[PDB]
A paper describes a structure:
As a proof-of-principle, we generated two dHax3 variants, dHax3-NI, in which Ile34 was introduced at repeat 7 to replace Ser34 for recognition of base A, and dTALE (standing for designed TALE repeats), in which the RVDs in repeats 3–12 were replaced and the protein recognize an artificial DNA element (5′-TCCAACTACTAGA-3′). Two structures were determined for DNA-bound dHax3-NI at 2.8 Å and 2.2 Å, respectively. During structural analysis of DNA-bound dHax3-NI, we found that while the low-resolution structure (2.8 Å) can be completely overlaid with those of dHax3 and dTALE, the high-resolution one (2.2 Å) deviates considerably from all the other DNA-bound TALE structures. In contrast, the structural difference between the high-resolution structure of DNA-bound dHax3-NI and the other DNA-bound TALE structures is a combination of both axial compression and rotational tightening of the TALE repeats accompanied by a slight distortion of the DNA duplex. The overall conformational change of the complex indicates that TALE repeats may retain structural flexibility even after binding to DNA. Despite the prominent conformational changes between the overall structures, when the individual repeats of the high and low-resolution structures of DNA-bound dHax3-NI are superimposed, the RMSD value is 0.23 Å over 30 Cα atoms of the second repeat. Similar to the comparison between DNA-free and DNA-bound dHax3 structures, the overall changes result from the accumulative effect of small alterations in the φ and ϕ values of the peptide bonds of residues 14–22 (corresponding to the previously designated residues 26–34) in each repeat. Supporting this notion, the 22 repeats from both the high and low-resolution structures of dHax3-NI can be precisely superimposed with the pairwise RMSD values between 0.3–0.6 Å over 29 to 33 Cα atoms, with the deviations mainly at the segment containing residues 13–22 in each repeat. These structural observations suggest that the residues 13–22 within a TALE repeat are responsible for the structural plasticity of the repeat.
Transcription activator-like (TAL) effectors specifically bind to double stranded (ds) DNA through a central domain of tandem repeats. Each TAL effector (TALE) repeat comprises 33–35 amino acids and recognizes one specific DNA base through a highly variable residue at a fixed position in the repeat. The crystal structures of TAL effector (TALE) proteins bound to their respective target DNAs have revealed that the residue at position 13 is the only one directly involved in DNA base recognition, whereas the 12th residue stabilizes the proper loop conformation. dHax3, an engineered TALE protein, proved to be a useful scaffold for structural characterizations. We then present fifteen crystal structures of engineered dHax3 variants in complex with target DNA molecules, which elucidate the structural basis for the recognition of bases adenine (A) and guanine (G) by reported or uncharacterized TALE codes.
Residue numbers in the entry: 233 to 721
DNA sequence: TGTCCCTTTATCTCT
DNA sequence: GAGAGATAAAGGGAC
């Protein structure tokens, strides 16, 4: 009955493509791959209840919840617990989705429910801090561990609640927490690290192995390799962790002696998530990129030194000719696009969309490069392609303004939020569009605009002190953080 | 056969 | 630009 079971499964997928979820093939694939057949079936059985009152989940939220080991249990649990978490604990549905959307989401949900009161009332955490702790695989473990260990970590060890939250808020947060508890004294007292440096190391995924590996290799990397404790700390706390540290141990001589890299640029390469992969890839590709592509070593190092640098390097090697000779991009432009986290996605997206953006939207190659040369470049490019025409027709923006909003980290968010909040800002708050554009055209433009609309609607006397124009100027180069900075004085 | 937890790597967003 | 936070995905081990 394998063929009938298969027919049943495909009928289920087909039905999900209809109401109420209207899932696309990508979404189906996501749930299948990450949550399995049981998650696909669970979504199908509960589609009405997940999208209906009292949950009202969007299809994207349903997809995010299902797309994990135990996805079925998470979906089941969200149906039981969301009304209490929202109405009793004061969480928003999106915060609930965030707690739910990990392997073991059911456990983290039951645990936020049980623990949020003690964490906030007795330990002094905010609900947002509790959400951040919960929103990872093993969230239950981290929540219980913070609850158990925050008092010892703060009083006996001197850490702030914020620092404990930082350590706890990664996958394996429990491991990281216990390892800080164990290893904070040695690393400070014996190695002379500050507590903040230890927190900075501990607050990445694999924080525990990173701490243990800093203890293990700090002396040999300094002594036998010539690095400073600072460099070792940067390598350990920049996401590279244990893998990066050990790979620097192995490859530093070869990269310096044979390939001619300074130890500083080797450190720059090691100092991101996937630093091990980046190091190995520079070792492999430095000759080829520097003899048969005329890229300088500086340029290669610059590409390698971001998270997933490996991917960026291989992608540069593959696409540099096509982008230079077919799309008319200069190698410097290709380097600039490559030299961010996710440079691979940005490059591939430029290869795909450059012609479209130049010819259907009239953008010059320089503008396309401008948009592409930030983290999340792919996202920004795709949402300019989507929203350029509507923002010009409906909201009366120029292509320049659209490119400007787009050309920062989070450009996608800033564009979408302009689309969502431009009407009410200008209509109900006699706010000007050039003004809203001004707010949107920085990193954090999104939360800036949102804090603005929050102020105008449910204002806050304390903050209710500046002009619909003074707050504008404030958001315009401090954003949300500036708005909060004033609104606590 | 799934569920839960942890590490590593890749990508995106904000301070 | 750098540091940091956050979301996603893979792959592994334990029951």
């Amino acid at each position: 009955s394998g063929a009938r079971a298969l027919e049943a499964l495909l009928t289920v997928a087909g039905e999900l493509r209809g109401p109420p979820l209207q899932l696309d093939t990508g979404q189906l694939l996501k749930i299948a791959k990450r949550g399995g057949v049981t998650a696909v079936e669970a979504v199908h059985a509960w589609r009405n209840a997940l999208t209906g009152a009292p949950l009202n989940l969007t299809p994207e939220q349903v997809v995010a919840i299902a797309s994990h080991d135990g996805g079925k249990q998470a979906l089941e649990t969200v149906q039981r617990l969301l009304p209490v978490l929202c109405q009793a604990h004061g969480l928003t549905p999106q915060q609930v989705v965030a707690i739910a959307s990990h392997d073991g989401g059911k456990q983290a949900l039951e645990t936020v429910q049980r623990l949020l009161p003690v964490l906030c009332q007795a330990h002094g955490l905010t609900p947002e801090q509790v959400v951040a702790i919960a929103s990872h695989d093993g969230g239950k473990q981290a929540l219980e561990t913070v609850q158990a260990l925050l008092p010892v970590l703060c009083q006996a060890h001197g850490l702030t609640p914020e620092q404990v939250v930082a350590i706890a808020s990664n996958g394996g947060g429990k491991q990281a927490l216990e390892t800080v508890q164990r290893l904070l004294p040695v690393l400070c007292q014996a190695h002379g690290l500050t507590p903040q440096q230890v927190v900075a190391i501990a607050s990445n995924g694999g924080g525990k192995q990173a701490l243990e590996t800093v203890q293990r290799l700090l002396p040999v990397l300094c002594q036998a390799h010539g690095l400073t404790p600072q460099q070792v700390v940067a390598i350990a706390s920049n996401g590279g962790g244990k893998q990066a540290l050990e790979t620097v141990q192995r490859l530093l001589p070869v990269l310096c002696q044979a390939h001619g890299l300074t130890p500083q640029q080797v450190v720059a390469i090691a100092s991101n998530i996937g630093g091990k992969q980046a190091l190995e890839t520079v070792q492999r590709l430095l000759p080829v990129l520097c003899q048969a592509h005329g890229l300088t070593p500086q340029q290669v190092v610059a590409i390698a030194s971001n998270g997933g640098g490996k991917q960026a390097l291989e992608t540069v090697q593959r696409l540099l000719p096509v982008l230079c000779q077919a799309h008319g991009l200069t190698p410097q432009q290709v380097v600039a696009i490559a030299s961010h986290d996710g440079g691979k996605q940005a490059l591939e997206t430029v290869q795909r969309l450059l012609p479209v953006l130049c010819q259907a939207h009239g953008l010059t190659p320089e503008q396309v490069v401008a948009i592409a040369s930030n983290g999340g470049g792919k996202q920004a490019l795709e949402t300019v392609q989507r929203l350029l025409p509507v923002l010009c027709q409906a909201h009366g923006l120029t292509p320049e303004q659209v490119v400007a909003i787009a050309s920062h980290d989070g450009g996608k968010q800033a564009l979408e939020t302009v689309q969502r909040l431009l009407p009410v800002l200008c209509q109900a708050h006699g706010l000007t569009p050039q003004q809203v554009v001004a707010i949107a055209s920085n990193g954090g433009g999104r939360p800036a605009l949102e804090s603005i609309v929050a102020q105008l609607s449910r204002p806050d006397p304390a903050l209710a002190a500046l002009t619909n124009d003074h707050l504008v100027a404030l958001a315009c180069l401090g954003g949300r953080p500036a708005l909060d900075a004033v609104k606590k004085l």
